[PDB]
């Protein structure tokens, strides 16, 4: 296919001024981008310009209060930045954080626009800070604004409010914010795979369990695939895609696919403890390309091992460009708790999705 790419070095300015070893490093996006040059993927992509989201566009999903408080950080002394971030769960703030969050969202809006107007079929967004933990009313988990959810609402806003958007969240953490923003919405299908461990894994809410299926009109349009019992990898993700993600996505018949593409389920990630390989990621991308006549935007969320994320996101771009997926030969048998996880999601969603029955 013809594949868009958006990257802006300005998104590197957002930094932890008290702890420069904090995993959500500026060089996350510079290394992913560099590795795209090194693999010469960049020359095969249509460069989409970055841009600031407007406060009007942020309001697609966030309150005035929340937009206003994060905007006020631009002009704070360090001791005020420190104390503002302590108001949230796992948030650091610098004078540049607002601008960077704006850049992450605008980059994704331009990418959605390039896709939906037919300038490209598919696109990768190399952006930070991440979005999926951000709520309507609060920052959380290194996230200021819900980039993915905003892009889903911005896409509906420049096309039609009916546009069926599938958000696949394969970041190792639950997109608490993405689930809540669309919980009562049957126009946005939210599928998250995430390490859960009975509430022990961040963000530590029962909201990420398989029995949270959506509310009212949204009942069945929220699919949590929670992993328990530690390490997971290619076999579990390939099994989850086959029995759940792809059957539900096919029934839903999305007109656009957003991937909340965290690479913290990657082998080597210090915060995920999982073993998804770049080849694994290449297979999940290729499978998603089978939907929405290939209309797929891949948006960076988390992922904290600089090699793993650079190798993993490059393999995804490579797939969007139409390259042949690496053999995933000799996959081991599934972990048991992963069979149980998949079967718990089937029992929860069979009532809503004939393709699972
Ligand atoms: O966005 C995230 N992943 O993609 C994310 C968000 C928040 C957390 C919180 N946490 N939990 N345990 N250690 C931590 C750390 C806090 C600061 C450095 S480590 C982990 C991960
Ligand atoms: K997830
Ligand atoms: K939903
Ligand atoms: Zn994560």
Q: Which residues make beta-bridge pairs with 223? A: 191
Instruction: Tell me the structure's resolution in angstroms, rounded to a single decimal.
Output: 1.9
Residue entry with tokens 């841009």: 51
Residue 312 in marked binding region: no
Give the number of the ligand closest to the Cα of residue 304: 1
Q: Which residues make beta-bridge pairs with 3? A: 122
* Cα 175–chain centre separation: 8
Residue 323 in marked binding region: no
Q: What's the CA gap between 163 and 159, in Å, rounded?
A: 7
Our answer on whether the CB atom of 141 is closer than 6 Å to any ligand 1 atom is: yes
Which residues are catalytically annotated? Answer: 133
- Could you give the dihedral angle defined by the CA atoms of residues 308, 53, 145 and 95, in that order, rounded to the nearest 10 degrees? 90
DSSP collapsed to 3 states, the chain: CCEEEEECHHHHCCCCCCCCCCCCCCHHHHHHHHHHHHCCCHHHCEECCCCCCCHHHHCCCCCHHHHHHHHHHHHCCHHHHHHHHCCCECCCCCCCHHHHHHHHHHHHHHHHHHHHCCCCCEEEEECCCCCCCCCCCCCECCECCCHHHHHHHHHHHCCCCCCCEEEEECCCCCCHHHHHHCCCCCCEEEEEEEECHHHCCCCCCHHHCCCCCCCHHHCCCEEEEEECCCCCEHHHHHHHHHHHHHHHHHHHCCCEEEEEECCCCECCCCCCCCEECHHHHHHHHHHHHCCHHHCEEEEECCCCCHHHHHHHHHHHHHHHCCCCCCCCCCCCCCCHHHHHHHHHHHHHHCCCCHHHC
Backbone angles phi, psi at 266, to 5 degrees: -70, 150
Our answer on whether the CB atom of 195 is closer than 6 Å to any ligand 1 atom is: no
What Rg, from alpha-carbon coordinates, does the chain have?
19
Q: Is the peptide bond preceding residue 330 cis, with omega within 30 degrees of 0?
A: no
The two structure tokens encoding residue 12: 């590197």
**Nearest partner of 140 among 89, 71, 99, judged by Cα:** 89
Q: Which atom of ligand 1 is nearest to the CA of 22?
A: 18
**Nearest partner of 258 among 136, 170, 347, judged by Cα:** 170
Tell the residue nearest (CA) to atom 13 of ligand 1.
Answer: 271
- Host domain of residue 97: 1-357
Q: What's the CA gap between 33 and 28, in Å, rounded?
A: 9
- Could you give the dihedral angle defined by the CA atoms of residues 55, 60, 66 and 70, in that order, rounded to the nearest 10 degrees? -40
CA of 90 to the centre of ligand 1 (A): 7
Total residue length of the chain: 357
Q: What's the number of domains the chain is made of?
A: 1
Our answer on whether the CB atom of 175 is closer than 6 Å to any ligand 1 atom is: no
Residues 6 or more apart whose CB falls under 8 angstroms from that of 167 comprise: 148, 149, 152, 175, 178, 182, 188, 189, 190, 191, 258, 259, 260
- Could you give the dihedral angle defined by the CA atoms of residues 101, 36, 313 and 178, in that order, rounded to the nearest 10 degrees? 20
Residue 212 in marked binding region: yes
Our answer on whether the CB atom of 278 is closer than 6 Å to any ligand 1 atom is: no
Check residue 118 and give left, alpha or beta (phi > 0: left; psi -120 to 50: alpha). Answer: left
């Amino acid at each position: 296919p013809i594949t868009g790419l958006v990257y802006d070095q300005r998104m590197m300015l957002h930094h932890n001024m008290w702890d420069s070893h904090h995993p959500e490093l500026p060089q996350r996006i510079s290394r992913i981008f560099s590795r795209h040059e090194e693999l010469r993927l960049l020359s095969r992509c249509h460069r989409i310009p970055a841009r600031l989201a407007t406060e009007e566009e942020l309001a697609l999903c966030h309150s005035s209060k929340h937009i206003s408080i994060i905007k006020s950080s631009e002009h704070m002394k360090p001791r005020d930045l420190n104390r503002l971030g302590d108001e949230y769960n796992s948030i650091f703030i610098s004078n540049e954080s607002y601008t960077c969050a704006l850049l992450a969202a605008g980059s994704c809006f331009n990418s959605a626009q390039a896709i939906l107007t037919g300038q490209v079929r598919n696109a990768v967004a190399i952006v930070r800070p991440p979005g999926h933990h951000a709520e309507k009313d609060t920052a959380c988990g290194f996230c200021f604004f819900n980039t993915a959810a905003l892009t889903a609402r911005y896409a509906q806003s420049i096309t039609r409010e009916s546009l069926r958007v599938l958000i696949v969240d394969w970041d190792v953490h639950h997109g608490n914010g993405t689930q809540h923003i669309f919980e009562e919405d049957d126009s946005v299908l939210y599928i998250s795979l995430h390490r859960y461990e009975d509430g022990a894994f961040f963000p530590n809410s029962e909201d990420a369990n398989y029995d949270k299926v959506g509310l009212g009109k949204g009942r069945g349009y929220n699919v949590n695939i929670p992993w328990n019992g530690g390490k997971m990898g290619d076999p579990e993700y390939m099994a989850a895609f086959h029995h759940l993600v792809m059957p539900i996505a096919r029934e839903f018949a999305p007109e656009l696919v957003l991937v909340s593409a965290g690479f913290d389920a990657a082998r080597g990630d210090p915060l995920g403890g999982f073993q998804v390989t770049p080849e694994g990621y290449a297979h999940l991308t290729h499978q998603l390309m089978s939907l929405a006549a290939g209309r797929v935007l891949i948006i960076l969320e988390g992922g904290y091992n600089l090699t793993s994320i650079s190798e993993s996101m490059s393999m995804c771009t490579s797939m969007l460009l139409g390259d042949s997926p690496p053999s995933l030969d000799h996959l081991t048998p599934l972990k048991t708790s992963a069979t149980v996880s998949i079967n718990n999601v089937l029992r929860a969603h069979a009532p809503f999705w004939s393709s699972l029955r």
